[PDB]
Every structure is written in C-alpha cells, then in structure tokens.
Design a protein around this motif. Structure first.
Motif, PDB file in Angstrom:
ATOM      1  N   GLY A   1       0.664  -1.248   0.080  1.00  0.00           N
ATOM      2  CA  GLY A   1       0.187  -0.252  -0.246  1.00  0.00           C
ATOM      3  C   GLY A   1       1.411   1.162  -0.573  1.00  0.00           C
ATOM      4  O   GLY A   1       0.051   2.063  -0.919  1.00  0.00           O
ATOM      5  N   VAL A   2       1.821   1.451   0.946  1.00  0.00           N
ATOM      6  CA  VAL A   2       2.667   2.837   0.374  1.00  0.00           C
ATOM      7  C   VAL A   2       3.241   2.362  -0.892  1.00  0.00           C
ATOM      8  O   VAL A   2       3.936   3.452  -1.083  1.00  0.00           O
ATOM      9  CB  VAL A   2       3.680   1.493   1.702  1.00  0.00           C
ATOM     10  CG1 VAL A   2       3.164   1.888   2.859  1.00  0.00           C
ATOM     11  CG2 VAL A   2       4.951   1.100   1.250  1.00  0.00           C
ATOM     12  N   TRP A   3       3.564   1.939  -1.089  1.00  0.00           N
ATOM     13  CA  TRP A   3       4.589   1.995  -2.902  1.00  0.00           C
ATOM     14  C   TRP A   3       3.006   2.495  -3.503  1.00  0.00           C
ATOM     15  O   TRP A   3       3.812   3.959  -4.480  1.00  0.00           O
ATOM     16  CB  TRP A   3       4.822   0.328  -3.220  1.00  0.00           C
ATOM     17  N   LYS A   4       1.837   2.058  -2.995  1.00  0.00           N
ATOM     18  CA  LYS A   4       0.701   3.160  -4.520  1.00  0.00           C
ATOM     19  C   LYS A   4       0.404   4.735  -3.948  1.00  0.00           C
ATOM     20  O   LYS A   4       0.712   5.320  -4.535  1.00  0.00           O
ATOM     21  CB  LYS A   4      -0.432   2.628  -3.583  1.00  0.00           C
ATOM     22  CG  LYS A   4      -0.750   1.247  -4.222  1.00  0.00           C
ATOM     23  CD  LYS A   4      -2.485   0.979  -3.467  1.00  0.00           C
ATOM     24  CE  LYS A   4      -2.553  -0.656  -3.791  1.00  0.00           C
ATOM     25  NZ  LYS A   4      -1.827  -1.217  -2.229  1.00  0.00           N
ATOM     26  N   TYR A   5       0.851   4.800  -2.548  1.00  0.00           N
ATOM     27  CA  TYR A   5       1.404   6.258  -2.750  1.00  0.00           C
ATOM     28  C   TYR A   5       2.929   6.541  -3.223  1.00  0.00           C
ATOM     29  O   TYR A   5       2.526   8.218  -3.905  1.00  0.00           O
ATOM     30  CB  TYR A   5       1.273   6.825  -1.247  1.00  0.00           C
ATOM     31  CG  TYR A   5      -0.547   6.717  -0.335  1.00  0.00           C
ATOM     32  CD1 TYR A   5      -0.632   8.897  -0.063  1.00  0.00           C
ATOM     33  CD2 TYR A   5      -0.625   5.861  -0.690  1.00  0.00           C
ATOM     34  N   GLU A   6       3.559   5.878  -3.292  1.00  0.00           N
ATOM     35  CA  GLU A   6       4.662   6.453  -3.227  1.00  0.00           C
ATOM     36  C   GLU A   6       4.737   6.909  -4.990  1.00  0.00           C
ATOM     37  O   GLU A   6       5.314   7.592  -5.682  1.00  0.00           O
ATOM     38  CB  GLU A   6       6.028   5.113  -2.645  1.00  0.00           C
ATOM     39  N   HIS A   7       4.686   5.490  -6.154  1.00  0.00           N
ATOM     40  CA  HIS A   7       4.436   5.838  -7.600  1.00  0.00           C
ATOM     41  C   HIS A   7       4.074   7.040  -7.478  1.00  0.00           C
ATOM     42  O   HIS A   7       4.002   7.059  -9.184  1.00  0.00           O
ATOM     43  CB  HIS A   7       4.652   4.556  -7.808  1.00  0.00           C
ATOM     44  N   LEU A   8       2.421   7.046  -7.534  1.00  0.00           N
ATOM     45  CA  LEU A   8       1.741   8.505  -7.541  1.00  0.00           C
ATOM     46  C   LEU A   8       2.505  10.064  -7.674  1.00  0.00           C
ATOM     47  O   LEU A   8       2.430  10.063  -8.537  1.00  0.00           O
ATOM     48  CB  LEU A   8       0.411   8.342  -6.928  1.00  0.00           C
ATOM     49  CG  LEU A   8      -0.848   9.199  -7.636  1.00  0.00           C
ATOM     50  CD1 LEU A   8      -0.870   8.182  -8.980  1.00  0.00           C
ATOM     51  CD2 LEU A   8      -1.727   9.049  -6.944  1.00  0.00           C
ATOM     52  N   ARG A   9       3.259   9.609  -6.221  1.00  0.00           N
ATOM     53  CA  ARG A   9       4.088  11.218  -6.498  1.00  0.00           C
ATOM     54  C   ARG A   9       4.500  11.839  -7.586  1.00  0.00           C
ATOM     55  O   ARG A   9       4.804  12.206  -8.464  1.00  0.00           O
ATOM     56  CB  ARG A   9       4.765  11.187  -5.172  1.00  0.00           C
ATOM     57  CG  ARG A   9       5.289  12.631  -4.760  1.00  0.00           C
ATOM     58  CD  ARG A   9       5.589  12.738  -3.414  1.00  0.00           C
ATOM     59  NE  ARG A   9       5.446  11.554  -2.588  1.00  0.00           N
ATOM     60  CZ  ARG A   9       6.775  10.638  -2.449  1.00  0.00           C
ATOM     61  NH1 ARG A   9       7.682  10.677  -3.004  1.00  0.00           N
ATOM     62  NH2 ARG A   9       6.169   9.456  -1.902  1.00  0.00           N
ATOM     63  N   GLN A  10       5.634  11.168  -8.180  1.00  0.00           N
ATOM     64  CA  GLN A  10       6.523  10.927  -9.227  1.00  0.00           C
ATOM     65  C   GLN A  10       5.525  11.370 -10.713  1.00  0.00           C
ATOM     66  O   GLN A  10       6.165  11.495 -11.391  1.00  0.00           O
ATOM     67  CB  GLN A  10       7.530   9.172  -9.518  1.00  0.00           C
ATOM     68  CG  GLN A  10       7.817   9.261 -11.074  1.00  0.00           C
ATOM     69  CD  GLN A  10       8.915   8.994 -11.201  1.00  0.00           C
ATOM     70  N   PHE A  11       4.101  10.251 -10.814  1.00  0.00           N
ATOM     71  CA  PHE A  11       3.523  11.091 -12.161  1.00  0.00           C
ATOM     72  C   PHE A  11       2.840  12.240 -11.474  1.00  0.00           C
ATOM     73  O   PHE A  11       3.085  13.057 -13.263  1.00  0.00           O
ATOM     74  CB  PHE A  11       2.183   9.572 -11.708  1.00  0.00           C
ATOM     75  CG  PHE A  11       2.961   8.246 -12.281  1.00  0.00           C
ATOM     76  CD1 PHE A  11       3.467   8.488 -13.273  1.00  0.00           C
ATOM     77  CD2 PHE A  11       1.869   7.518 -11.651  1.00  0.00           C
ATOM     78  CE1 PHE A  11       3.386   7.008 -13.839  1.00  0.00           C
ATOM     79  CE2 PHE A  11       2.352   5.772 -12.257  1.00  0.00           C
ATOM     80  CZ  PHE A  11       2.598   5.945 -13.241  1.00  0.00           C
ATOM     81  N   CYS A  12       2.557  12.578 -10.367  1.00  0.00           N
ATOM     82  CA  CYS A  12       2.275  13.865 -10.347  1.00  0.00           C
ATOM     83  C   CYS A  12       3.999  14.890 -10.697  1.00  0.00           C
ATOM     84  O   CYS A  12       3.624  16.649 -11.663  1.00  0.00           O
ATOM     85  CB  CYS A  12       1.821  13.896  -9.205  1.00  0.00           C
ATOM     86  SG  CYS A  12       0.204  13.180  -8.537  1.00  0.00           S
ATOM     87  N   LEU A  13       4.646  14.746 -10.222  1.00  0.00           N
ATOM     88  CA  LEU A  13       5.848  15.369 -10.553  1.00  0.00           C
ATOM     89  C   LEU A  13       6.122  15.952 -12.256  1.00  0.00           C
ATOM     90  O   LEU A  13       5.796  16.806 -12.485  1.00  0.00           O
ATOM     91  CB  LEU A  13       7.286  15.058 -10.205  1.00  0.00           C
ATOM     92  CG  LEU A  13       8.459  15.719 -10.707  1.00  0.00           C
ATOM     93  CD1 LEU A  13       9.214  15.556  -9.280  1.00  0.00           C
ATOM     94  CD2 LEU A  13       8.600  15.570 -11.429  1.00  0.00           C
ATOM     95  N   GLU A  14       5.616  14.846 -12.836  1.00  0.00           N
ATOM     96  CA  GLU A  14       6.115  14.493 -14.087  1.00  0.00           C
ATOM     97  C   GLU A  14       4.667  14.984 -15.105  1.00  0.00           C
ATOM     98  O   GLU A  14       4.575  15.949 -16.286  1.00  0.00           O
ATOM     99  CB  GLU A  14       5.976  12.974 -15.294  1.00  0.00           C
ATOM    100  CG  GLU A  14       7.586  12.864 -15.426  1.00  0.00           C
ATOM    101  CD  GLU A  14       7.562  11.312 -15.540  1.00  0.00           C
ATOM    102  OE1 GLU A  14       7.361  10.834 -15.406  1.00  0.00           O
ATOM    103  OE2 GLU A  14       7.722  10.788 -16.950  1.00  0.00           O
TER     104      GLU A  14
END
Ligand SMILES: [Zn+2]
Ligand SMILES: [Zn+2]
Ligand SMILES: [Zn+2]
Ligand SMILES: [Zn+2]
Lengths: 129, 11, 129, 11
Positions: A1-14
């Motif tokens: 579940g922690v990786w869900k919040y994490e990988h989303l953040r990189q998407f928001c950056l790009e």
C-alpha cells in the motif's frame, strides 16, 4: 500500500511538466471548462463546493491538491481527477499531448499503474494507449 | 445529506 | 424556490409511512445492502464516510438526514437518495410497495415532482409510474 | 482532493 502513494507522487511530478506545456495554449477564454469528449463537464474539487474551473485552473488546482494529499479509496479519487488532465489534453490539445507522450509515455505508464492496482474503473480510461 | 458532485452532464 | 423545500417535506413524511411498512420484512440479515436492480450498491451518506448500511438502515438514516436538512443543488442530492427507498422497495419488496402505492400514489407524485422541478436526472427514474 | 462516493458498481 505504501508503494501506491509513492509511485503516484512521481506521476504528479511529471504531470506538472505536461501542465506547464499546456498552459501555453490552454487558456480560460477558450478552454472555459474542464471537458474531454462527451457532454460531461468536470467540476474542480479544490474548493468548498465543486467549481466550474476553466481547464487550466482545474489542472493546476487538482495537481496541487494531489501533491498536498500525498506528502501528508482516497487514492481512487485523486487518480480519477488527475486522469482528466490527460483526457483534456488528448482531445483538446492533441499536438501537445502527442509531443509529450512520445517523450515520456506518461499516460501509458499512468494507465498501466491504475489498472495494475485497480485504482480507476476501466470505463474511465478513454485515452488510447 | 451532504453532497460533492464533480461530474455534470450537459443539457 | 421556497415551494421546492416545502413540498419535499410532505413527501418525506409520507415516505416514513413506507419505511415503517418496510421494516416488517426489510431486515439486515437478508437486505444486507442498499440495492435496487443492477450491480450498484448505494452507500449511506449519513456518516463521515459513505457506509454500506443495510437497506433498512440506509432508509432510516437517509430520511432522517432529509428531515434534518429541511427544517433548517443540495435538493438534487436528497431527492436522488430518497428515491432509492422507492426503487429498493419496488424491486425487493414488490408486494409492500404495490400496497402502499395503490393507496398513496407516493412514488407517482414524487416522480412528477422531481421531473417538474428538474431535481433528478431522468436516467435515475427506474420505477414505473 | 476530498471524496464522497455514494454509488459503487459490483465486481
Ligand atoms: Zn485546454
Ligand atoms: Zn479549481
Ligand atoms: Zn429490503
Ligand atoms: Zn447509514
């Protein structure tokens, strides 16, 4: 579940990169509402009551809200709203979308991610590949 | 109850 | 606009009559969720987060929330949620629905009212007459 | 942002 919040953040950056490219022609005098293809208007959720923000505003306010939620089912809502940035660009700014996607595959990567973790209904995935 | 509608279908 | 809030209140009063008739067989061990006909579950809005209340609970909590909102676009939401009490009764308690409707025409009267004042999308009006 | 989803489609 922690990786869900994490990988989303990189998407928001790009995704900020896309938003910055869009703000060169997505203006509130012509993109007066947030739409993609059908007869749906999308109301910006960064307000006390959902607001008919112009597309550029919807984009900024939503990315801003997602960046804020992340550094602090809720995932599904963010993903659904963020995705509309792609669909608005694909249908109303096709050249910019195409240029950005050919370089980053961001929509492709984002689509695979929300399907991989069941974060959006497949019915909402209206941009090809 | 309370409401928070974010999609509206054009007339 | 004032008549909109007003006529709705009388509907909620008679709708309590239906809810009381239903509670004789709409129990949480068998009506474990609020549904009508398709593969939609309806989540009760009388909670901090929408909750999978059993149908009887959804009915009570929603009528309670509507009675509270009234004595104090928001109309559209109340109407949409209240209407599910009719659709649940029509599809899962057809005999009780039919008995009550033959005496009160409440669903008929309510349907005409939300159409008369454009308070629900016609797409949601799934109970006949 | 904030969310308040009241309809869910069964798998
Ligand atoms: Zn635009
Ligand atoms: Zn906004
Ligand atoms: Zn029942
Ligand atoms: Zn409830």
């Amino acid at each position: 579940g922690v990786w869900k919040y994490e990988h989303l953040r990189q998407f928001c950056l790009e995704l900020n990169g896309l938003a910055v490219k869009l703000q060169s022609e997505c203006h509130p005098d012509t993109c007066t509402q947030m739409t993609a293809t059908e007869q749906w208007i999308f109301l910006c959720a960064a307000h006390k009551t959902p607001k008919e923000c112009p597309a550029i505003d919807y984009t900024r306010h939503t990315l801003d809200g997602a960046a804020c939620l992340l550094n602090s089912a809720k995932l599904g809502s963010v993903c659904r709203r963020i995705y509309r940035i792609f669909s608005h660009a694909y249908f109303h700014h096709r050249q910019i979308f195409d240029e950005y996607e050919n370089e980053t595959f961001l929509c492709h990567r984002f689509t695979k991610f929300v399907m991989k973790y069941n974060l959006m209904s497949k019915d909402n995935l209206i941009v090809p590949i | 109850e309370w409401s928070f509608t974010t999609v509206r279908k054009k007339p």
